[PDB]
Design a binder for these strands. Structure first.
Ligand code: MG
Ligand code: MG
Ligand code: MG
Ligand code: MG
Ligand code: MG
Ligand code: MG
Ligand code: MG
Ligand code: MG
Ligand code: MG
Ligand code: MG
Ligand code: MG
Ligand code: MG
Ligand code: MG
Ligand code: MG
Ligand code: MG
Ligand code: MG
Ligand code: MG
Ligand code: MG
Ligand code: MG
Ligand code: MG
Ligand code: MG
Ligand code: MG
Ligand code: MG
Ligand code: MG
Ligand code: MG
Ligand code: MG
Ligand code: MG
Ligand code: MG
Ligand code: MG
Ligand code: MG
Ligand code: MG
Ligand code: MG
Ligand code: MG
Ligand code: MG
Ligand code: MG
Ligand code: MG
Ligand code: MG
Ligand code: MG
Ligand code: MG
Ligand code: MG
Ligand code: MG
Ligand code: MG
Ligand code: MG
Ligand code: MG
Ligand code: MG
Ligand code: MG
Ligand code: MG
Ligand code: MG
Ligand code: MG
Ligand code: MG
Ligand code: MG
Ligand code: MG
Ligand code: MG
Ligand code: MG
Ligand code: MG
Ligand code: MG
Ligand code: MG
Ligand code: MG
Ligand code: MG
Ligand code: MG
Ligand code: MG
Length: 111
RNA sequence: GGGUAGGUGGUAAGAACCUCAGAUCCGGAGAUUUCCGAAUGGAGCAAUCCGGUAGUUGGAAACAGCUAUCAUUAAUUGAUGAAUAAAUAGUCAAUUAAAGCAAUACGUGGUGAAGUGAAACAUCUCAGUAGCCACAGGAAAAGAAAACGAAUGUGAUUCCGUGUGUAGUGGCGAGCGAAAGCGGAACAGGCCAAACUUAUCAUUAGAUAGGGGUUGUAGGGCUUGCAAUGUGGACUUGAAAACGAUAGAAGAAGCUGUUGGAAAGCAGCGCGCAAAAGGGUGAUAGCCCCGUAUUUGAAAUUGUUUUCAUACCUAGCGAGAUCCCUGAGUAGCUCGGAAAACGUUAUUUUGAGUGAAUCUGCCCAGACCAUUGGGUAAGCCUAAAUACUAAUUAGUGACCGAUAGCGAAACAGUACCGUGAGGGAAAGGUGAAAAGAACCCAGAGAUGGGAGUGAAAUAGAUUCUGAAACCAUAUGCCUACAACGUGUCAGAGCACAUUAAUGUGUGAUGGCGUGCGUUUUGAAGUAUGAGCCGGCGAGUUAUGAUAGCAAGCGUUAGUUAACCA
RNA sequence: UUGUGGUAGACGAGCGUUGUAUUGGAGUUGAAGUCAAAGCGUGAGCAUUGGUGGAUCCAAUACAAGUGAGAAUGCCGGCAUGAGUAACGCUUGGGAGUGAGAAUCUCCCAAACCGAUUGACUAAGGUUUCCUGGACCAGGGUCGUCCUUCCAGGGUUAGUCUGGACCUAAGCUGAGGCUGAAAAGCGUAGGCGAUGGACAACAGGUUAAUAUUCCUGUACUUACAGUUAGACUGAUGGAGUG
RNA sequence: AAAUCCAGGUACGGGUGAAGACACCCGUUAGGCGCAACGGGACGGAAAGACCCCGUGAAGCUUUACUGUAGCUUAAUAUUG
């Protein structure tokens, strides 16, 4: 399975942004990146191009989007625990459904 | 089958979809596989053209779709059948194999030079090398003594060390160079012909299909008995098990502060280890991530080994007879060549000719004869150790790091050159992240100057660092009566202030002064080589000999080579 | 105390580069590289500081070398000198327009050369160079708003034309077969092979680009089937013509 | 653009010198730098002299040079009575 999936809450443990909590919107496995909303906001200088029906307007000024972040800098956020902390996860397989599930190793919380 | 939550191959954003009834992706097994190409229906200027036959569907037929088949050679079988009665030649049909390619590499065989060395050259060497051709194989070749060879001897072949640069062979010159023996790697021996016998062929068999036999301290057959039902194979089918190969699963351990754009660096306090190999993460991470040690797992295909059964092959010691068999245009011999270390010679081989004997036999022990001894030619097959790497997996390097390393880090045998065979380059790096510069000004625009992002824009796509030759700008000094290898020793004036040093920059003027390498008796040279700058560019390696120096071991010393772990 | 010129040459002692092995050390508070400066050594050489640079490097003792560049009419790359020099490879003037910019582009009027040709149709070859619009990185021996250059789109219509589905010449290939150490060479029957033979379409119009091909008009030729009438049909071979 | 180019700030007379000097010795002359000319010199440039000699170099050709050989011719022998 994968450490980070599309949807789970995640934070950053290194870089300029420390303790930045967000939701992963999309995961690129090949480049080992991850787009997390609200973090790594870059502002491309949007030019103007008019060669299509939609390009006839293409209103783009100082649009702030999302920059991808290396998957190593991401860490899963705990929610079930009363005192939330950042830890590592296991890949135990519960015989109830025989499906692999991530479980933290500093607690007993699933996913 | 594995495995998930993403995917629609790269320069690549966007549009539109797919995907949790399990996608994309990885592995095993299959399906489809246009045309040329061995190309094989016929042709042909390769990727084109023109068909025949037998079916089936439309048409009223020509015709047009949709299928299968149609080359040559060799072997077997059957039919037909000339000159010419029979019979062959030939013709036709059916079945089974062969064609070709590549691994710039190993094997075998045929053919086979020259440059060169001998300080010339012809014998010789180079060299049975290059090249040309044929046939393979996963290896090939060789192979079970008519042997070595001098002994109370060894007992297929192959490969390694030594014997040794020894015996020898050489216009006895240049050179060439074994076979024994010894030490090792591996080890395996089997099977036909003939006798004799069985059955069948107008049985003129001298032929076909079986039993019997495979030799040297001779064997086998003929007749007559005892003991045997086993052990082992280079061996067929099956069944079972184990070890693997082709995807994978799990897989421990860290926070705080400081410089910094960013920590993983540094410091403090800890923790894990059968994991401190490696890669990435904004610098240099055992504990951030992927992994690694370790424990594991295969539906399907495939490899090795073992066990059981089952085919096939596989068996001893006597007696008598005195009879038969033991590989012929063969061994020898003569005339020309060759192979072996040998430049032809005892041994091996053959183009021409001739030509034997049959265990009281034949061959051999470097001419030859006799004695002694060794071995059984003229028939076949044979695993292992041995040779090599185009390719698949893992990994290593006192190997290279864009003039190096493969010619080719990029889309390189490309661009390009030549009718053709053939010849054959150069070229890598933005930033952590494109956040790739919106906007303003000048300009026709590219572009430039600001702004903005960024730690850095003198990192801006001309994109890591940026040397010299070369071209321009400028502070300071000097230079327009001056004979100059352009420098050196003295020396005013001018202008500054340093790796603080009897300082530095320029140099009115005085004295002296014909470059650097090469090759020469002798070069400023009217001898030669270099336009300048930068990179590259020429005493090595392997095997032996001698001598110097040093160390280890020593007076029945010293030291191993191959090979094994 | 005696000495210390020196080529060929002999001998001895050292420096420097890259990497490896052992120790220690420095580095985003800035390493290598790289530039400058008024330093230290007997020599190869070695430091200090500052600028640039952005991640490795240094000292000691040993070991191994693709280990030292000024010359080879040396190889490769760059840049000078000659020198803004020779040369720019046969064809004039003006008006109007476009354009930011015009001797060179567009149009018009002349002018000058070709006129058995610089005119027109095609074979061979070339392979999109053809037409339209746009552009002025590069190429054009100047310039360029323009080009046979570049970009985007488009363009080649056959029963009668040129060649196959027809035929042969030189020649090539060639089952069998002959010859030859091998590869192969020769060659019969067959099969290819035009530059030749046989075979039915002419006139005009149309698009920016095609036209005996598209369109209009008028024709012709060869096959197959049905039908009417007549006739016995007569080749893979013989003969004539070709 | 081009061949060329050791660095140049590149006079003349007599002498000297590797024997014919822009550079040496002794004298004479000459302000700095171009442009257009013409070729005296720079033993000018282009071509590692083709002439000559040397090399125990190469190649072509010749012959009663040497050693061989294709082909031609003669004999023995086998096919061969
Ligand atoms: Mg599946
Ligand atoms: Mg010779
Ligand atoms: Mg010689
Ligand atoms: Mg010689
Ligand atoms: Mg064999
Ligand atoms: Mg895993
Ligand atoms: Mg882990
Ligand atoms: Mg690490
Ligand atoms: Mg003999
Ligand atoms: Mg020999
Ligand atoms: Mg005997
Ligand atoms: Mg003897
Ligand atoms: Mg015998
Ligand atoms: Mg290269
Ligand atoms: Mg380069
Ligand atoms: Mg070509
Ligand atoms: Mg800028
Ligand atoms: Mg540049
Ligand atoms: Mg740069
Ligand atoms: Mg003066
Ligand atoms: Mg005067
Ligand atoms: Mg003077
Ligand atoms: Mg003077
Ligand atoms: Mg002076
Ligand atoms: Mg002087
Ligand atoms: Mg020198
Ligand atoms: Mg001389
Ligand atoms: Mg001389
Ligand atoms: Mg001179
Ligand atoms: Mg000369
Ligand atoms: Mg010379
Ligand atoms: Mg020169
Ligand atoms: Mg140089
Ligand atoms: Mg010694
Ligand atoms: Mg001396
Ligand atoms: Mg070192
Ligand atoms: Mg520095
Ligand atoms: Mg070198
Ligand atoms: Mg030049
Ligand atoms: Mg110039
Ligand atoms: Mg001139
Ligand atoms: Mg002139
Ligand atoms: Mg001129
Ligand atoms: Mg002209
Ligand atoms: Mg003119
Ligand atoms: Mg005229
Ligand atoms: Mg014309
Ligand atoms: Mg073109
Ligand atoms: Mg045009
Ligand atoms: Mg145009
Ligand atoms: Mg131009
Ligand atoms: Mg028509
Ligand atoms: Mg034809
Ligand atoms: Mg014709
Ligand atoms: Mg036309
Ligand atoms: Mg030039
Ligand atoms: Mg004199
Ligand atoms: Mg000469
Ligand atoms: Mg000679
Ligand atoms: Mg010679
Ligand atoms: Mg004769």
């Amino acid at each position: 399975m994968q450490r980070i999936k599309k949807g789970d809450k995640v934070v950053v443990i290194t870089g300029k942004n420390k303790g930045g909590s967000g939701i992963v919107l999309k995961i690129m496995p090949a480049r080992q990146q991850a787009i997390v909303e609200g973090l790594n906001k870059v502002t491309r200088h949007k030019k103007k191009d008019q060669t299509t029906k939609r390009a006839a307007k293409q209103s783009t000024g100082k649009v702030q989007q999302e920059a991808p972040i290396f998957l190593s800098k991401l860490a899963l956020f705990d929610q079930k625990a009363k005192q939330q902390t950042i830890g590592k996860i296991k890949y135990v397989m519960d015989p109830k459904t025989n499906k692999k599930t991530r479980v933290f190793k500093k607690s007993n919380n699933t996913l």
